């Protein structure tokens, strides 16, 4: 149902849970962020048979 | 330290009665020493004694190792004392300034403007 009118704003954001798991780990900047990006993609060297994988996959 | 004073493009500037060169200085593990110390060594390289020597400039390059300035050497005192911009004479004292700050001049001037005949009150008196 919807009870207490559907014109009401703040609805979806005021009934959602608020949680976090904020970092303790410090991320890199500038030079080293590119260094890891280079090595992790190309100089590993893992790749195998034709696949769709992407650099993300939480599936 | 042990430091080197080294010439560069001398001129015998007869019209102003002085000798102007560049003060090219090398310093090994240090750089940027007092200007007073520099003119001592130049005193005992042309035997003109250090009260008619005047130097200024002296910007020091990165990492030290060199500094370069500009120096005059007058033949006599009175040729310096006459020619010389005032602040360079007062740089190692023999002259001052006063005068006195700025402003107290202009506000007095406009008050002097609005009297005639007698302005001796405003010159002393406000």
């Amino acid at each position: 149902k919807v009870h207490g009118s559907l014109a009401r704003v703040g609805k979806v954001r005021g009934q959602t849970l608020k949680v976090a798991k904020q970092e303790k780990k410090k991320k890199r900047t500038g030079r080293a962020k590119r260094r890891m990006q280079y090595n992790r993609r190309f100089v590993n060297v893992v790749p195998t048979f034709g696949k769709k994988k992407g650099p993300n996959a939480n599936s | 330290d042990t430091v080197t004073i080294r010439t560069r493009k001398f001129m015998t500037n007869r019209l102003l009665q002085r000798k102007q060169m560049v003060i090219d200085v090398l310093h090994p593990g240090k750089a940027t020493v007092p200007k007073t110390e520099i003119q001592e060594k130049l005193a005992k390289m042309y035997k003109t004694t250090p009260d008619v020597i005047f130097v200024f400039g002296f910007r020091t390059h990165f990492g030290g190792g060199k500094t370069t300035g500009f120096g005059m050497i007058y033949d006599s005192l009175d040729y310096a004392k006459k020619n010389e911009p005032k602040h360079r004479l007062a740089r190692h004292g023999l002259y001052e300034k006063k005068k006195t700050s700025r402003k107290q001049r202009k506000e007095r001037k406009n008050r002097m403007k609005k009297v005639r005949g007698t302005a001796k009150a405003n010159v002393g008196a406000g």
């Binding site: 559907l6 014109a7 704003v9 703040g10 609805k11 979806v12 954001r13 005021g14 | -």
Partner: protein, 142 residues
Amino acid sequence: MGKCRGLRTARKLRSHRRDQKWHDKQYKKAHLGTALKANPFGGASHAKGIVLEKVGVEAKQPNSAIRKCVRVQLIKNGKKITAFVPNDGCLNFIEENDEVLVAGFGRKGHAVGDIPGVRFKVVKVANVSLLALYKGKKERPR
């Protein structure tokens, strides 16, 4: 093709082009200035006004929603503009009979999305952004 290619026909070219340029839509708005006179803006990127009162604005089909706009009168013209309010719960951070700062959508004359009759949106309530009100890194100054 199908047109003069003389050697002394500079006049017949440069007078023809100066006429047939006015049939273009864009050119005809820029140079008559009827744009300026008709708009509630002076050509300024933003503008400032004072709230008149909240409204609810229905959506165009297929979509059905209520979009919670405002209606505002301006400082320097006194004419009225109907302006959208962004993200959820930001309506509450706008209070009636205060000043606001408006801005166009990003289509430069035309009504955007499924909402009709709205051509403007709202960015700052009172020297404070809708972002910092929404996110919670600032608070109402009153």
